[PDB]
Structures are given as structure tokens and as C-alpha cells.
Amino acid sequence: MARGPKKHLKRVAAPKHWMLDKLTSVFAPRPSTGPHKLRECLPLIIFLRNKLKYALTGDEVKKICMQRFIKIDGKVRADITYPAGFMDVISIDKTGENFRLIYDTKGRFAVHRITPEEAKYKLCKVRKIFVGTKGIPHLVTHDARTIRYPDPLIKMNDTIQIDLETGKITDFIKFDTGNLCMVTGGANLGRIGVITNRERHPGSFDVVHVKDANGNSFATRLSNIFVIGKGNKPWISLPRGKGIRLTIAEERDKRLAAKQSSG
Amino acid sequence: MKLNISFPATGCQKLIEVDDERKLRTFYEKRMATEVAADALGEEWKGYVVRISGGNDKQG
Amino acid sequence: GISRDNWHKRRKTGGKRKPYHKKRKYELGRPAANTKIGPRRIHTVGVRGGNKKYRALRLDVGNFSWGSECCTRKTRIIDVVYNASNNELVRTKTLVKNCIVLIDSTPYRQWYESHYALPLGRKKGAKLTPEEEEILNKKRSKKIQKKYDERKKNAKISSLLEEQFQQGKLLACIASRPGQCGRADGYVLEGKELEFYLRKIKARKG
RNA sequence: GAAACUGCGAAUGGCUCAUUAAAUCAGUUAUGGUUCCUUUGGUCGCCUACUUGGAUAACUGUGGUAAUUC
RNA sequence: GACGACCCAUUCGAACGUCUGCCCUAUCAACUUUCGAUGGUAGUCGCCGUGCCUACCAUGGUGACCACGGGUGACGGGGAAUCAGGGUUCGAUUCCGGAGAGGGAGCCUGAGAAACGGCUACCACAUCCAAGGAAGGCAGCAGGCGCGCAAAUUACCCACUC
RNA sequence: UCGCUACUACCGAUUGGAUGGUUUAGUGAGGCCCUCGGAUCGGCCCGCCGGGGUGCCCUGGCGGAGCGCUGA
């Protein structure tokens, strides 16, 4: 087919962490270009009728977004699709609600409601340091913000708190052993645990061991690690589950113990 | 042939039909945008000069 | 049309591969510049992704440099002498990267005379005395000597250099692609290169 | 508010399996060898300026060709 | 607020390149080279790397571990049928990648095309004509002829999905 | 072995015919590039009038000369 870029993505080509069905038609939404990557996005309209169920058809979302009740990262967006991903804040001010996009231990974007006070900032990883013209530095982040004049000891794989109102980061975390980390990709996903150890290989695909407070050791690639706060002390709010990563046997035991499927 | 005489100071233009060889001999063997005296065209022209701006061959 | 494909041409074993995909726009030729020396004719060529590419035909000026004392001035490009890729290109006066050409040699002397306070090779001192001595002698009080003293014994200028000024020509090396850049540029020969290419010139012609 | 100039899309999709045996393709790797509409974030002061120059369409009117989105 | 523009970063990619993996055939055993085959040096071209191309110079490269040549009712993969274990057979075909729009070649526009619901020419077809000329490409959905053992409605509609 | 019918393959004169693909040489449409070419259309200078200003200037309208210089 191709001679230039494509503009469709089907249902069955689309990722499985949007939790799509198979008895609505061939196409799926496809996020338009933005700061996040499409195997890490949650498109906007999938949050509004395949999670929260305010809307019921795509035409309803087109009538909602135009009214400008929606924000994303403290700015106003007004389209059916926007590629919000890990560590962004949605803000509906009419309902007085604020969400956060973060991973379940299952490895899918959950509903993590939060105070409006918490929703005035987000946590951003540094990925690249690049000296611009005339002796000025830059940062580059995964949410694709270029923040000039950072403190001169902040380096890649650190994380920085950004004030959505004014940009211009107030504080930061430094990447060190024994600090608390979250996983953002790979086979292990959504697990929370301290760093414990590092491993280096000259070349590529260095790995990073992890250990949790349930006494389990696991490892993952370097570039799927994200820092959340100092040892056993997140600088963010955490959802239920909390990176335990239960076996399937124990999950069965909980459900038949509470006998929970009715209220 | 025909002609389409045009007066560009009213924006009006009219047709006339001739087949007299002599009057048309003034136009023959000359390229577009040449001017020639239209005094040959009759006795109702006596200080007129025209410019030919082109036209249409047979078969359009 | 004329193409720069890679799905033609035999593999290592002498094998052939049968025709696969039809020619495409990102594998493409477009005939050679074949730039000469003459009055400036430049053509602007649209190229892939935008970002227009200048093709220069018949240049006559390039920005050479004398990096020994670090001055670079705009000078005329007279004629070709040596082309280290082919012999035929010299005969039709084609100008490409790493040629050896001739220049006027004029501003380099003007710069030297004003800065180091000495002329180069000269036919006669008679010319200098009414005018061109006006610069060389100076009326400063105070900084007739004071400036010039620091310039002294940093101007030994080498033997192979000095003899060339008298002819009014100097041998410089094209260090640009004129057909891609739209400009001729280069550096002037010094040292062992300048000894080398003389021997090639005298070997090949004459 | 028809028409017309301008911007954008028409390189996506749909369809077929003819060509094609280290080719296609799959897993794995590489741009420190390159290009990139668009989105997102930064980049934004070395007798004319109270705003410069002159033509084309629609439109009006006259036509040609057996015939054309002429 | 809206629009536009230069550069950097980002996103969607695009393009080349690495290592490993292939059906039948020797009644195909030597193959490749100035009509560049392999390498060196310089240059041209191209978005870039590169014998891609040109000049000069060297004589290499490949093969019984099956090259080279020929054949394939051979598009490739994710898969499908059968099945104790090991296998055998199939994969045009809803997802992904590729190639092509009657057969060949060339080219315009654009960020992206060697595009065919763009263009120009040749070749094979076929249409209109006042014979001066003009116009065309259903391997898009329906539908017709032909071919055969062999395959549907010239229907309704943008409400869903995009 | 020889004789009788159905049926299959092989050799074969005809230097068989038909269709398709390779190959030397010659010829070569069309486009692109390059080198020329200049149909044709404007601009700025000198007369008369209008406006502004100091026979003259600028700009506009109108005509003619060299069409001089210049662009497309």
C-alpha cells in the first residue's frame, strides 16, 4: 500500500491495554501525533466512553470537547483524540474531579482520582541534555517539554517536578540506589520497589535490579524505569494494589473471602 | 469569415460579415498584434486603425 | 530516468537477480554540473524534503585563505593546472573538488605590506617611491615602531612562496563542491603539497 | 448568501496475487551514514509605516467549432 | 484568540545497513570481468553510506559445507487440517509486510508518488466523427460478455465504527 | 514368429507450422538537462494638460521621438 504515512489503525492491530472489544467495527481511534508514543498512550475518547461512560458515541465527545470543560496538563484541549500517557493530569473543573494516569499492577491505565492540590504538578523524567546556542543548556523529557536553565547537577534518569502553571521546575529527585521506582514498560509493569542494585554493560541494554517490600527480586531494562520518590516514601499518591504483583492463586482467594461481586 | 469589431471605450462590440477579398487582403500574411488601417474596410472608416487580437481557426 | 539504483549489479558469486521493483524518486541521478570558469550562472534545483540545492555553472571567484597567518580574502580564479582525478578535465577547464588552480594573488600582498610592513618580490623599487611608499613609510609618532616591532621575525616568508608573487599567481586547492554548494572556496598550498604538485605539473606537461 | 480566487486533502482507504528463491519476509540489531508534512514543547529587537506596488476570476457583454469538464 | 514563518527538540514514520533462517533439480559443475566482475585512490551524483557512476591502478571474488544454471498451478509471515510420541500436508483469502493497476518507458506537482479515480509517448486494443479532429483503461461497489466442473443485488443508509 | 481389432509411446521427410522469450548490428518516439533563440509585453528619461512645489521639478492623464537604458 504505502507511499506516504498512514492515517488508520484497526481494532485488532491496536494495543490490548485500551481493552477494546471485537463486535464494534473494523477501525479503532488511533491517537494523533503528540508528545507520547502510541504503545504508551491512552487516547482521550477511550477515557470517556470505554472507562467512565459519560459518552456513548464518538459524536457525543465532539459535542463535549468543544465546550472546553476538558483540560490536559493544565491547558485546554478540544479534539476527540489527544495522546495523553503516563504521568499526565486530566482536569474537569465543572464536576470538580481530577484524574491521574498511572499503571495498575496488571499494566493498564487506571482511574486514580486525586485532590486538586496534587493536580498542580506532575513528575517528569529527564532523557537528554543538550547544550543550545551561546552557552545555554536544555532538558528533554518524555512529555517533550524543553525546560531551559535547569540546576547543574541534574542528569538523565533523574526526575523533576514541574509546575504546570509557570513551567520552570521547582525541585527534583536524584537517581540513586535504594530510591523508589515504578516500571513503565516491559514484561514487569506497574510494579513498585526500591532500586537495590544497578548493573552496567559498555554498549547498550543495561539492566536495573529491583526489590519490593514483599521479598521478591526481579529486573528490567534501564529505560523502562521511572523514579517516584526516595526509599519507601513516594513523592506522589499511589493507587490500590501498590505494585505487589500477586499470583493468580492468591487473587482467587481474596474474591471468595470477601464474597464480593455485590454490594 | 466574420469579424468582431470592438470599441474599448464603451466596452461594446458587434459583428459584421464579409467575404470581399480586397478588404481582407489588408489582414492577410500578418501576425497577431499588428495594427493596420481599417480605412480599407469602407467609406465609414477614414481615420480608424485597428489591432488584431487573434480569433478562431475553422474547427474551433 | 538516469538512476542511482542498487537493485541492478551482480552479487559476489557472479549471480544475477531478476527484475524487482520499478525505479523510484529517491534513487535518482540528474546529470553532472560540468562547471567551468566564466561569468556566474546559477540554477536553483528543488530537492527531496525541500531545502533547495544550488548548482553553480561558470564561477570566477572563490574565497581562498592563507591559514599560515590566518587571512582569507576574495580572489579571482584564473585557470586550471592540475586535476588529480582525470587529465581530460584540465583540457576543457572543468572545476571540481581538489583541483589546483591559479589566482590573482593581489589582496594577500596588500595585507602583508600593511601588517608586516615589507613588500614581497618586486621588479624595481622605483615604482614604490611616489605612491605605495605612502603606506609603507608612516608618520605615526608613537607606533611607527611600537606596533611593527612585534611583527618582526614572524615574516621569514618561505622561498617557494615568494617567487610566485612575482609572476602574480599562486597555487591553491579547491576544497568545496561547486555543484552542490553554489560556491567555490579553498585553501592555498603550503609545505610539502606545494613541493609535490609542482613536480606533477612539470612531469605531465612540458 | 450562490459563484469565484486562496488554504488543505486527493500518496489514506478499497482491490488483486501477475512478478518475485538470500529476493520477499520473520526474529535481532544500526543511523555516531540520513530525511521527516503534522502535533506537542521551546526559539521570536542590528510627499508610505496611521499601512506600500499592479493584475486576474466571479460579474457584465460579444463569439468560434460536427463534438469535449474545449 | 485566529493565521503565518525560521531553527531546535518531539511524534508519525520513511530510507539504507548487521547477524541467523529456504521448496524441487547435477540428463545444470565450474561461474563472474572493461558491455564493473573483486579491491585500492580521487572525483561526480544523491537525503545520506556505498563501484551507485567516472578516471587511474591492482587481479581478484565464488564453489562438492552444492556455487552457477534450470523449474515452481512459489507472494512472505502471524496461521490451518490431520495427529499417542516423532511428523505429514496446506497457507489466493478479513491482521502485518510487499508488489502491481492493459503491456513498457519517461515526467509534473508536493513534505511524501516515478501516482494511473495525474500527465506525455510508443506498443496491443476499443469508441465517436460533418473524416477536419476528439475521447478511453471496472485486479473500487454493483452489472454484462467470455472462460470453464465451479461462485450472489445495476438493493437501503452515514444512525453505529472511523 | 506370422495373421486379426482397440490403444499408447517413439523415430521421421515436411529443412513443418504457431506462439512466447532472449541476442548482434542499424534505425529511434517522448520527456528531462544543457547551450542558444527573442515572438511578445512592460518600466524609467524629453512635449501638452491636471494637482502639488520651486521656465524647471515630482506625480497623474494624453501623444510622439531615440526607442536610448532596463525587466519579464
Say which amino acid occupies A62.
K
Neighboring chains of A (3 or more beta-carbon pairs < 8 A): none
User: Do residues A128 and A212 both lie within one domain?
Assistant: no
Domain identity same for A45 and A19: yes
CA distance A77 to A32: 13
Answer whether any strand F atom is within 7 A of the Cβ of B49. no
A193 in the same domain as A83: no
List bases in chain E with any atom under 7 Å of a protein Cβ.
Answer: 7-17, 31-33, 36-38, 42-55, 61-62, 67-69, 95-101, 105-107, 109-115, 132-133, 159-162
Pick out residues 53-82 of chain A having their CB under 7 A from any atom of nucleic acid strand E: 57-59
A107/A216 same-domain check: no
Supply φ then ψ for residue B15, to 5 degrees. Answer: -110, 170
Indicate whether A102 and A139 sit together in one domain.
no
C57 touches strand F (CB under 7 A): yes
Enumerate residues 6+ apart whose C-beta is below 8 A from C28: C2, C3, C4
Kind of pairing between the strands at A217-221 and A207-211: antiparallel
Grid cell at residue A184: 513503565
> Which residue ranges form the domains of chain C, and what is each CATH number?
1-30 (no CATH), 31-105+169-206 (no CATH), 106-168 (1.10.168.20)
What is the CA A206 to C1' E18 distance in angstroms? 21
Q: Is A9 left (phi over 0), alpha (psi -120 to 50) or beta?
A: beta
Residue C38 C-alpha cell reads as: 566564466
Rounded-to-10 torsion of CA A18, A102, A118, A111:
50
Answer for C87: CB within 7 Å of strand E.
yes
Is the residue at A144 inside a domain? yes
Distance in Å from E30's C1' to C19's CA comes to: 25
Q: Is A20 in the same domain as A76?
A: yes
Q: Which nucleotide is nearest to B34 (CA to C1')?
A: F40
Whole-angstrom CA distances from C174 to A55, A106, A158 are: 69, 65, 49
C204 C-beta less than 7 Å away from strand E: no
**How far are the Cα atoms of A60, A165, C1, C2, C81 from residue A69, in angstroms, in the given order?**
13, 18, 56, 58, 75
Distance CA A143, CA B55 (A): 66
Joined together, the cell numbers standing for residue A14 give 491496536
Q: Answer yes or no: is A254 within a domain.
A: no
In whole angstroms, E5 C1' to A177 CA is 48
Residue A259 lies inside a defined structural domain of this protein: no
For residue A209, give the C-alpha cell: 535490579
Judge if the beta carbon of C25 is closer than 7 A to nucleic acid strand E.
yes
**Same-domain pairing of A105 and A31:** yes
In 3D space, the residue among A234, A247, A197 whose CA is nearest the CA of residue A217 turns out to be: A197
Residue A48 domain-assigned (yes or no) = yes
User: Is A261 among the domain residues?
Assistant: no
* B60 contact partners, CB below 8 Å, separation of at least 6: none
Parent domain of A16:
1-117
The reply to whether A199 and A106 lie within a common domain is no
Q: Which three cell numbers stand for residue C24?
A: 523510484
In a domain, A31, yes or no: yes
Nearest nt to the CA of A6 via C1' is D12
Q: A110 by DSSP, 3-state: which?
A: coil
Question: Measured between alpha carbons, how far is residue C196 from residues A72, A212, C89, C170 in Å?
Answer: 69, 72, 20, 15
What is the rounded CA–CA span in Å between residue A163 and residue C142? 63
Q: How far apart are CA A58 and CA A29, in angstroms?
A: 10
Report yes or no on A191 lying in a domain: yes
Residue A11 sits in the same domain as residue A112: yes
Distance B1 CA to F56 C1' (A): 55
Rounded to an integer, what distance in angstroms lies between the CA atom of residue A112 and that of residue A48? 15
* 3-state SS class at C61: strand
B34 CB inside 7 Å of strand F: yes
Phi, psi of C199 (to 5 degrees): -70, -35
Q: What was the resolution (in A) of this experimentally determined structure?
A: 3.0
Domain count, chain A: 3
Let me know if residue A258 belongs to a domain: no
Same domain, A160 and A198: no
User: Which C residues between 172 and 201 have a beta carbon under 7 A from any strand F atom?
Assistant: none
Strand pairing category for C184-188 and C61-66:
parallel
User: Closest nucleotide to A147's CA, by C1' atom?
Assistant: D42
- The SS3 of residue A44 is helix
Query: E strands within chain A?
Result: 9-10, 27-28, 41-43, 70-72, 75-76, 83-85, 89-92, 97-100, 121-132, 136-141, 159-163, 167-173, 180-183, 192-194, 207-211, 217-221, 225-229
End residue of a domain, out of A117, A143, A164: A117
Q: Which residues contact A3 (CB under 8 A, 6 or more apart)?
A: none
Question: Is the same domain home to A94 and A3?
Answer: yes
